[PDB]
Design a protein around this ligand. Structure first.
Ligand SMILES: Nc1ncnc2c1ncn2[C@@H]1O[C@H](COP(=O)(O)OP(=O)(O)CP(=O)(O)O)[C@@H](O)[C@H]1O
Length: 256
């Protein structure tokens, strides 16, 4: 019924970007300003409107230069659309692996890691928990602005992927901003290894076991001691002795 409602006539849709698990993506064009957009769409026997849109409902309440921006929605009838700013280099994961991002230096990696921090710190200070933070869920636009995306599992103040999830969250579903910091830790590993998959080789059953028992991935060669020292900080056995996003950010802004 509401104020973010965009008429469907106004959006075109020009090409496909994403798969069909509950609905695909597509680049489109918003005719009334001649700007590109990402349209997320809903495969029609699934989810429920409510469950699709809470991702929107969260974005409605956010404004920040490293948080992908909601333009609006077409819930007038099906398929449901969630319209958002188009990011010209796709997931951070991809960017690091392919387009340009493969061949860049450690200062590039750092400053793109600070933008994620910056966005997260804003979420922190607004009492939000993302819950699904990783490189695949971060996007890239022009001049390598990096933004944070996917607020599907986001909340104010349940299934999951083992390797980005903190041991307390795995064992007890105690999820919090500090579990989000754990993930940032993993993200950092991903960045500084030009998009590698974490805990190489291990089952995911091995990982639950090993990390609850104290194990942490070794420093990978390429990565500034400084940064590795910071990963470990985010991987602190105990939630409440991990940095705030505030502190994390500040750290990154120091450093050669
Ligand atoms: N707003 C946006 N702008 C530009 N590209 C986007 C975008 N949203 C998604 N994409 C691109 O399409 C991909 C689709 O991501 P999405 O989460 O929709 O499906 P997916 O195939 O990646 C399954 P998963 O959620 O496990 O990553 C992204 O990784 C990204 O490259």
């Amino acid at each position: 019924h509401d104020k973010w409602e965009i008429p469907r006539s106004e959006i075109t849709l020009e090409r496909k970007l994403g798969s069909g698990q509950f609905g695909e993506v597509y680049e489109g064009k918003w005719r009334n300003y001649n700007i590109e957009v990402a349209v997320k769409t809903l495969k029609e026997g699934t989810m429920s409107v409510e469950e699709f849109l809470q991702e929107a409902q969260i974005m409605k309440k956010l404004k920040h230069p490293n948080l992908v921006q909601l333009y609006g929605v077409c819930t007038k009838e099906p398929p449901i659309y969630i319209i958002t700013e188009y990011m010209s280099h796709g997931s951070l994961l991809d960017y690091l692996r392919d387009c340009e991002g493969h061949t860049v230096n450690a200062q590039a990696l750092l400053d793109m890691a600070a933008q994620v921090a910056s966005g997260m710190a804003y979420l922190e200070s607004q009492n939000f928990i993302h819950r699904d933070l990783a490189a695949r869920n971060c996007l890239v636009g022009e001049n390598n602005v990096v933004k944070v995306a996917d607020f599907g599992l986001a909340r104010l103040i349940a299934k999951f992927p083992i390797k980005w999830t903190a041991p307390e969250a795995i064992s007890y579903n105690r999820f919090s901003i500090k579990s989000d910091v754990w993930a940032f830790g993993i993200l950092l590993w991903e960045i500084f290894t030009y998009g590698q998959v974490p805990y190489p080789g291990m089952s995911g059953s091995e990982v639950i076991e090993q990390v609850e028992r104290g194990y942490r991935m070794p420093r990978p060669q390429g990565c500034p001691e400084e940064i590795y020292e910071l990963m470990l900080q985010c991987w602190n056995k105990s939630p409440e002795e991990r940095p705030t996003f505030a502190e994390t950010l500040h750290a990154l802004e120091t450093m050669f």
